[PDB]
Each structure stands twice: as C-alpha cells, then as structure tokens.
C-alpha cells in the first residue's frame, strides 16, 4: 500500500454494502473522513485564485 | 439544387470558452494550409520572390509541420481583411431546418498547434443550431470576395436572436449554458449580508 | 445607512468601477418615481443586462429593469423588510435584456430598426458572458458525494421512502408530492449545489424524483405497463433482478426506429416549405382596408392571437397582448391576411399580418417563416396520441388528402386549423392564416392557380394540383418530374406566380 500510495478496493458486484450508510460513516468519523477544502489555480485571464467553496478531488477511471 | 462546392472544408467542433466575440471562428492549421493555398501562395511569391513552383512545393511541405514564415502570412492574411474582423465563410450543420442552421462567421485566427484538427466555435452561437461535440462534422464554406461577404450577412449570428413564435419576445437560444449559469447563481443568492432589518439595526 | 444611487448613473460606469461597490445594502433610484432596495450584487448583475439603453442616453428607465423589481421602498416599512427578491436563472436574465430593448422601441415612437435592437442584445449577452466568467473565477460551483448527502439525511426525504403503498397513487401523488413539498421550502438547503440549480431552473424535478423517491412503474418495448414498481431510487441503486431488468426496458424504449423518423420529418419538412414559399414578402405599413376577419376566441387560442389587431368599440385598432381574459367567449373583427390589399401579388402589410412581423427580419420569405415554424415544433416533439399521428394529421388537413377544401371560405377554416394546431403545438395565428393562404387559388374553373388578392374572393386546391401547376420551376424541384412535362396545360399561356427556385432552374439567366 505504501509504494503503491492507493489500497486497491475489491467490489463484487453483489457486494451486501448499504451505498450511503457507507457515505454517512465516511463524512461522520475521524480517521477515514476525505480532506474537503479549498483549491487554487490559474483562471483564463491568468490570475492565481483560490475557490470560496470546500472542493474534493477524487480518481477516475478514464478511456 | 446542389453542388460540390470549391474552396470548402469539413472538421469536427469545439468551444471557444475563454473571452471572445461570438462571431469568430478559428480554424486548424492543417485546413488552413490547404484551404488557403492561393492566398499564401500570392504572398509568398511578392515578398520573397518565390517562383509558382517553389511556392506550391512550400506550401504542400508546411501543411503536417509548424512554419514560423507561415504563420505570419496567416495573421497578415487575417488583418488585411480590414474593416472586416478576418475572413468572411459560413458554418452549416446538417439536418438544415431553421435560421442558425446556416451562419456567417470570420476566421480571425489559425490555430498553432497541428494536433488539434477541429474548428472552435463560440459558446453563444451553439444553441441555434443544436450543434454538440459528439461527432458532429460541420461544413464550413469560404466566401470569394466581398460582395459575397455582404450578402451572407443576412444570415449573422444576430438575425435569429429575435423569436419568431411570439412577439415582442428573445428566443431561447440566446440563453446562458448550464456551467455559467450556476457560477453566477453561487455568487448573487449567496447570503453573505445579514437581513435587511438588522442591516438598519 | 442605505446609500442611493441614480440608475442611469449606474450605467455610465466603466467596468472597474461597477465592479468596486461596496457590499451592501442600497436604493437604486429610478426615472419613474420608484426606489428599489436591494444588495450590490444583484444590482450589478441587473447593470449588466441594461446594455443596449448604454447606446441611448435620453430613454428613462422605470423600475421593472431591476431583478428586484418588487421590493419598493413605501412609507410603511411592512412592505419591504421581508420581501423575497426575483431568482436568476438563465431565462430571467434574457427577459431583462428584452425589457430593455422593448423599452428603447417604445420611448423612440417605433422608429429604431429592430434588427439594430437584436444586434445589441447578442452584444450585451456576449459582454455579460466576458465578465461573469473572469470576474466570478472564484465562484464556480462543484458537486461530491458531500452534496448528495445533505439532500438524502433530510428527515422528510427519507420519510417519503418507507411505509408507501406500492401503487401508482400511492408513489406517483403521495411519496413524490412530500419530496415536492421539501424542494420547495425556501428555508430548505441553503448553500446546496444540488438545489440551488433546482430552484434557477438547471435541474428538473422528474430526475431528481427518480433518485431520491422511488423509480414508480417501467415500461415495456409495447408501452404496457407492469403489475409491480420499482421500490427503491437511482442513489440507493437496483440490484434485484426483477426490477433491474424492468428497469432496463427504459434504455431499450429510448432507442428507437428514429432513422425512419427523421426520413418522415424531413419529407414533411420540404414538402411544407416548398408551397409556402409562394407567399413572398411582407411589407411595413398599412394598407387601410375596411376588410376585417370574425374569429372566435377561446381559452385555448387566446395565447395564440398575440400581436393581432383588432378592431374594437368606437372603430379604433388595439392589439392583443395575452392577457385580455375578458375576449374569451366572445367574437372580435380582426385585421386578417384574408382582407389585405397590398398591391403585391404576392405580399402583405405588417398590420394584417400582425406585430409577430416587427421580430422578422427584413427581406425573409414570409411564407417559409410560417413552414419554419410549424416544422420546428413538430420536429421537436416528434423526436423527442403520438406526435406522428399528429403530423399525418396536420398534412393530411392543409394538403386537403374534414379536409380544408371543404370549407367554402377562409374564414371558417382558419379557428378549426387553430385549434387542431394549438391544440398539440403552439402555433401562432400569423403563421396559420399564411398557411391557409398558400393553399389559395383564383380561379378553378378557369385554372388560375395564382394567389388570389383579397384573400376572401378564393377557393382552396389540393397540393398535389397546386405544385404542379403554379409556376415549373417550383415543380421541377418536388417528385415526378417527368408528369409535368406531358401535361398540356403547361404550354398555354397563362399569368403564373414565381417561386424562388425559378432562378436555378435557368442557371442565374434573368
Ligand atoms: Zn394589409
């Protein structure tokens, strides 16, 4: 896991896994709760800004 | 009714999202390599002293790789095209049924990078044709002259802006996409002031 | 406290300087007398859509054109210290450069080009488009999973899921209607990306249903319905097989024989365009005709005579304008295409035609305007009783094969042809009456196909006929071909209208 940086998830199909309890432990607890804050980045007139709003970053499986 | 017509190009679609006019178009630098021959090949052989031969052959070997000497024949083409924005062509997408369907743009750039083979359109002119990105090949058609120019005038982005179902009315698609829209809404009904009646205290 | 400002002062502000006022709350102080209170950024989204009065310094502007046109300040504070404000959404914001444009026709007596006007709109839309999204970079709205959670723990939400009855009133009425209830609160999901772009319109309720409530009652390939529903929402997911595969009759309905659609809208499409086209132009002005038209007005129609003139009590022209609730019922002499006598053979004046013309732009085929727009509707609804019928219905009616040459006058005809048409489509009474009017013949004794001038000295002819027999360069362009060519009349010398094909058909010789 820690050369990898990721721990790699099995999720059969048939999982027995209620989808949003899972979400509602996740926002409620200490240890496994996401980092929510904000970002920053360059807009199109090539200022730095950084977003008001709590922005998450998350992994996609892209083709 | 209909014809294969010269001096014509065909590509896919994308956006031009960054501030912009709304009645400019850029092209890719292979389609304008090859549309533009003749045009290139007038400037090539006045300011440096290309023969017909010399100037095809340049042409021709430019059109898969980037050429500095080129590019700025592009913009010198694009800005002698004056009191014009750039270089009058009309942008078709099929099936034709309504006015913007059919309209009239200026090329006012070619864009540097070879990789890219689509036309960038204006966010504002995409919901009069009903055009998206998924595969939709347009057909773009340059105009001669300049009294070509001024006739297909009549088919400008504004001439489809007032609704022709109800009166005194702005057609739908002069609307704001989605993506914009819930930009400005996150920051007008934000509350960021306390209530009017303690703002009086 | 409440600083005031003047609106047209506002407006002569440069960018920079509209962007730097403060956050607050002030009076924005209006040319009709009516002060609006407000905050800064609503104000400055409201600036932004004044563009074109920037061009106009001498047109007033009353106090409507502000988003928040309902908070006046008045003597009793009981009517502005808790007023709810307008919400922006994406039409509102053209409804406002429409005001503005409107505003600057009316002030300049119907003197300023419309086509100026639409220029200017497009224009402002596009400065609004370029400043909004440099200067509001910081406040793009984002979506997660921390999103969906504060929609789904809601008390109410999650009490419209348990404990309903697995019926189509007992999902569809009950459990949908409380989650209504809940989306609606004012009060409710502050600050939320998911309702916020519910209550501005960029969302819609029927997905939003199907993920929080119950998915309700699939269909199959046939449009039969199935005994049980699906008992659970999109967020939660489906994992029995049951009500999966049902489920999945939905993706297999949504893809359809639509290449045999698009052949028939299409057909339809061109052979409506190519008849209409015989009406040619419409000409501003007014051709002082004592011709007037007898229509009845109804519940249904009274939407669609919008922009009509008609003539009311001590014999003055006043035109519709949607609202007059009390025509309804009754029976009104309207200025009709039927009764104008243009000396154009194949033209009309803006007044019969209505004030639908002043939005058409100058020079534009008239005829193909009206096909353009019966075509678009049906296209639309077509592709996305079937709507197939309906358009077999319409043809089948103007192209007379309860047939439009049964009836002996246009006058009785064109209310039934509205509200067929209103009935499904929203269809203007401009655009019908030019309809109907391309279907118009002179003569059939005598075989003068020509349109006839008035309107009400004609008779009707069935497409076929018609397309044949009013000009060859409109009937080379149709089918068959080859029939025209062994038709005898077709050498005798007779007056004939033109189409624009004619041009083509000679190659560009005049
Ligand atoms: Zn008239």
Known sequence: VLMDGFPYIYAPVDDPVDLMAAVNKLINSDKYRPHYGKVSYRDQAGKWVTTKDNVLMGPLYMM | ?201 | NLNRYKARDLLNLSYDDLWSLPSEWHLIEFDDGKTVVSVDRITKLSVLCWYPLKHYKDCPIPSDHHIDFNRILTDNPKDYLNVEGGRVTSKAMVKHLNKAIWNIYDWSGETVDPEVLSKLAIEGKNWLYNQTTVKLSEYLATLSMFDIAEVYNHPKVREANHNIEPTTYGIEKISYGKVKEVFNDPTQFIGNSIIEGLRSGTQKTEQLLQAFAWRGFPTDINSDIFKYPVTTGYIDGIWNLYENMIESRSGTKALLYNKELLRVTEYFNRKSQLIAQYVQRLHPGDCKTTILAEYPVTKLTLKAFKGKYYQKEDGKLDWIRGNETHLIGTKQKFRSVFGCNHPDSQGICMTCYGRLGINIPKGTNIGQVAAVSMGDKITSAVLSVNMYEVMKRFQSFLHSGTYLKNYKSPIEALPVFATMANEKISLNISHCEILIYAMMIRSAQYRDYRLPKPGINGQFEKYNRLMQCRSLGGAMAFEKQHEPLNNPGSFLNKMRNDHPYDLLVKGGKL
């Open chain 2, 1 to 201: 009714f209909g014809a294969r017509l010269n001096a014509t190009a065909r590509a896919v679609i994308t956006s031009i999202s960054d501030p912009h006019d709304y009645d400019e178009l850029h092209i890719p630098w292979g389609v304008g390599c090859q549309l533009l021959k003749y045009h290139l090949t007038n400037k090539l052989k006045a300011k440096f002293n290309m023969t017909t031969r010399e100037a095809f052959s340049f042409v021709y070997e430019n059109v898969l790789q980037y050429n500095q000497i080129i590019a700025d024949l592009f913009k010198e083409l694009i800005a002698e095209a004056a009191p014009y924005k750039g270089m009058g062509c009309t942008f078709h997408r099929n099936p034709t049924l309504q006015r913007g369907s059919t309209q009239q743009f200026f090329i006012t750039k070619v864009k540097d990078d070879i990789n890219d083979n689509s036309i960038s359109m204006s966010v504002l002119c995409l919901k009069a044709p009903n055009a998206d990105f998924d595969g939709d090949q347009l057909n773009l058609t340059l105009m001669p002259d300049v009294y070509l120019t001024k006739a297909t005038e009549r088919i400008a982005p504004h001439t489809w802006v007032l609704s022709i179902d109800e009166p005194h009315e702005i057609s739908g698609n002069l609307e704001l996409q989605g993506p914009v829209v819930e930009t400005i809404i996150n920051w007008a009904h934000e509350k960021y002031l306390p209530p009017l009646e303690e703002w009086l205290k």
